Ligand binder design. Structure first.
Ligand SMILES: *[C@@H]1O[C@H](CO[C@@H]2O[C@@H](C)[C@@H](O)[C@@H](O)[C@@H]2O)[C@@H](O[C@@H]2O[C@H](CO)[C@@H](O)[C@H](O)[C@H]2NC(C)=O)[C@H](O)[C@H]1NC(C)=O
Ligand SMILES: *[C@@H]1O[C@H](CO[C@@H]2O[C@@H](C)[C@@H](O)[C@@H](O)[C@@H]2O)[C@@H](O[C@@H]2O[C@H](CO)[C@@H](O)[C@H](O)[C@H]2NC(C)=O)[C@H](O)[C@H]1NC(C)=O
Ligand SMILES: *[C@@H]1O[C@H](CO[C@@H]2O[C@@H](C)[C@@H](O)[C@@H](O)[C@@H]2O)[C@@H](O)[C@H](O)[C@H]1NC(C)=O
Ligand SMILES: *[C@@H]1O[C@H](CO[C@@H]2O[C@@H](C)[C@@H](O)[C@@H](O)[C@@H]2O)[C@@H](O)[C@H](O)[C@H]1NC(C)=O
Ligand SMILES: *[C@@H]1O[C@H](CO[C@@H]2O[C@@H](C)[C@@H](O)[C@@H](O)[C@@H]2O)[C@@H](O)[C@H](O)[C@H]1NC(C)=O
Ligand SMILES: CNc1cccc2c(CN(C)CCC3CCCCCC3)c[nH]c12
Ligand SMILES: *[C@@H]1O[C@H](CO)[C@@H](O)[C@H](O)[C@H]1NC(C)=O
Length: 527
């Protein structure tokens, strides 16, 4: 029986057998008052002490969210859907600690992605037991509010100030600072890591003064706040809140009366109307996400980044070879996970309308012009691959590279990777390549489980990645120093070296997507 006295009371864990060893898991520790009733849309309130032994022996409720029903029964989509009951009572976190209890272990804190509208810490691919077992780090993950329940914003109004799900994350980091030493963890050695919206979240914790003392280092997988989907402007956020109000029958003149009306609505009424608060959405629509609230985020984050107003520390950033392909089968015409999705020029043009709905004609032709100068006009997958690259470069790769350039210009060590291995168990079709989200299982070390049908090459790739991530967390340097590995050089804004991650040859390259990102970073913002 493993009991730990936290500062709010004793929690009971459970023992896991992992790789002929043991990991102690505390699943579902509450870290905030449940944000129900008068607390919906507010910042998370601090938790009150209990005197019993809280049983942390099961993942807790996932936060309310809409579920992907686009491919019922398909593991490629349903593996991302919540695997615990949805509930507004969802402000819980998880801790995996090595057995025997470490003395001063480095802590990894996972922040999941999902477009700020979906996600949960209990997903199989976020299971921290392999990292704890193999690298003897402590892994922490938390649920945070998503959608309107996490990011509804009437900025300046404390009944719905915005960024609540970001403050959820923050309160959880605070929990680690106050409590993790009782678990054998070192609160002075905490590394945040996250993917997609989780990575965008990590990047905003680097920018938020209230988070600066709650962590040491940061890892950003396939995301950053300067991604075009990641921050909502004050204007859109207000228009979206008001539109939600009209759709629910909550239109009032007194802004507070609107929030109170929205507080007596059932979560499903709010979730159902979430998709229509914008006139033209895209498969990448983030209807309710981070905004400039003057609290978590004191200014437009592009300005903070450009002018060096962020935590000075090391970062590890990277992207996957085919970030954009996954979103093509959520709306682009002629695309399907069940055929090879050879699309025509006209379908490509139609696809640009789907992904760039409010962009001028000239802007859309400028995308076409820069992505359709063919090395071979007759290749039939030319247009199919261009659309994936357009979506992937615009939404993920170029913002991540731009974030890393700007961050490193202020003197900090930064390390950039390009993940280009397609999982041998990937249930999506081959034309979608190295998809968004499918490095996560390698980072969490699922291929180290021999029973799990991964190849031997994949076990070795995950082992090296797991070591690099742990070495970055512990020491600020993502090297694998023992097995004659390629040395990972720091990313500098002049030479922009990065490391490729694949089962064959791990290589040093320079200036990822140079031509494509000059278009997205220095042309397209002007259209
Ligand atoms: C700001 O919001 C208005 C209102 O949006 C409409 O009403 C909401 C309650 C919701 O149901 C939306 O889906 C509606 O579109 C937007 O105004 C609409 O704009 C479209 C196209 O521009 C037009 O066809 C509709 O008739 C407009 N509806 C109304 C009531 O004016 C407006 O576009 C939003 N602003 C931005 C920049 O997106
Ligand atoms: C690839 O599939 C898409 C999707 O169509 C559906 O899925 C198919 C696998 C099959 O089950 C079809 O019966 C379904 O309609 C095809 O896109 C459709 O194409 C037709 C004619 O080309 C068009 O009228 C529809 O509007 C398209 N629907 C969508 C959602 O785009 C596509 O043509 C297929 N391409 C190839 C190369 O096979
Ligand atoms: C908390 O857990 C106590 C310890 O029992 C352990 O957990 C239960 C769920 C069983 O799996 C048992 O075999 C374990 O040893 C329980 O006695 C207690 O009832 C639990 N408290 C609450 C409120 O559920
Ligand atoms: C735990 O270690 C503390 C020092 O932490 C050091 O600095 C941070 C930045 C990490 O990178 C970590 O690897 C370093 O060891 C001590 O100050 C503290 O007293 C120690 N406490 C215990 C109980 O061992
Ligand atoms: C390192 O490699 C181990 C197996 O490879 C063996 O060890 C190295 C040092 C060489 O001698 C090689 O020829 C041997 O076959 C793995 O078991 C281990 O997990 C690897 N470690 C990391 C961090 O990747
Ligand atoms: C930027 N992020 C993002 C934005 C908007 C929506 C989502 C979703 C939810 N739905 C709409 C798409 C799911 C796909 C994600 C990519 C991994 C394979 C599964 C398909 C996940 N991220 C999102
Ligand atoms: C809205 O009504 C509330 C009463 O709950 C009041 O406290 C607030 O000042 C009012 N705001 C405006 C703008 O009238």
């Amino acid at each position: 029986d493993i009991i730990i006295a936290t500062k709010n009371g004793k929690v009971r864990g459970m023992q896991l057998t992992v790789f002929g060893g043991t990991v102690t898991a505390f699943l579902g520790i509450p870290y905030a008052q449940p944000p129900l009733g008068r607390l919906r849309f507010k910042k998370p309130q601090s938790l009150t002490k209990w005197s019993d032994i809280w049983n942390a022996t099961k993942y807790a409720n996932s936060c309310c969210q809409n579920i992907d029903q686009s491919f019922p029964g398909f593991h490629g989509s349903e593996m991302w859907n919540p695997n615990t009951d949805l509930s507004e009572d969802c402000l819980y976190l998880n801790v995996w600690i090595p057995a025997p209890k470490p003395k001063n272990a480095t802590v990894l804190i996972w922040i999941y992605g999902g477009g700020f509208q979906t996600g949960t810490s209990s997903l199989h691919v976020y299971d921290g037991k392999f990292l704890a077992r193999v690298e003897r780090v402590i892994v922490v993950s938390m649920n945070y509010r998503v959608g309107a329940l996490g990011f509804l914003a009437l900025p300046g109004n404390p009944e719905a100030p915005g960024n609540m799900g970001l403050f959820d994350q923050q309160l959880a980091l605070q929990w680690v600072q106050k409590n993790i030493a009782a678990f054998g963890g070192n609160p002075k050695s905490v590394t945040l890591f996250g993917e997609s919206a989780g990575a965008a979240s990590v990047s905003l914790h680097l920018l938020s003064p209230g988070s600066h003392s709650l962590f040491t280092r940061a890892i950003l997988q396939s995301g950053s706040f300067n991604a075009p989907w990641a921050v909502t402007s004050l204007y859109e956020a207000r228009n979206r809140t008001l539109n939600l109000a009209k759709l629910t029958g909550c239109s009032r003149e007194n802004e507070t009366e609107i929030i109170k009306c929205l507080r007596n609505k059932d979560p499903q009424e709010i979730l159902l109307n979430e998709a229509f608060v914008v006139p033209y959405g895209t498969p990448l629509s983030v209807n309710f996400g981070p905004t400039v609230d003057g609290d978590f985020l004191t200014d437009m984050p592009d300005i903070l980044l450009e002018l060096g107003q962020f935590k000075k520390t090391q970062i590890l950033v990277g992207v996957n070879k085919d970030e954009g392909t996954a979103f093509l089968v959520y709306g682009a015409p002629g695309f399907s996970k069940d055929n090879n999705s050879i699309i025509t020029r006209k379908e490509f043009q139609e696809g640009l309308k789907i992904f760039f709905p409010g962009v001028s004609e000239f802007g859309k032709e400028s995308i076409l012009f820069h992505y359709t100068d063919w090395v071979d006009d007759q290749r039939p997958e030319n247009y199919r691959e261009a659309l994936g690259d357009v979506v992937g470069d615009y939404n993920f790769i170029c913002p991540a590279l731009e974030f890393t350039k700007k961050f490193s210009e202020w003197g900090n060590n930064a390390f950039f990777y390009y993940f280009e291995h397609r999982s041998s168990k990937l249930p999506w079709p081959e034309w979608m390549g190295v998809m968004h989200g499918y490095e996560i299982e390698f980072v969490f070390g699922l291929p180290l489980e021999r029973r799990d049908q991964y190849t031997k090459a994949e076990e070795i790739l995950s082992r090296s990645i797991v070591k690099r991530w742990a070495n970055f967390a512990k020491y600020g340097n993502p090297q694998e120093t023992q097995n004659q590995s390629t040395s990972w050089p720091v990313f500098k804004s002049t030479e922009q070296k990065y490391l490729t991650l694949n089962t064959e040859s791990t290589r040093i390259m320079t200036k990822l997507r140079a031509q494509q990102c000059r278009f997205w970073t220095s042309f397209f913002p002007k259209v």
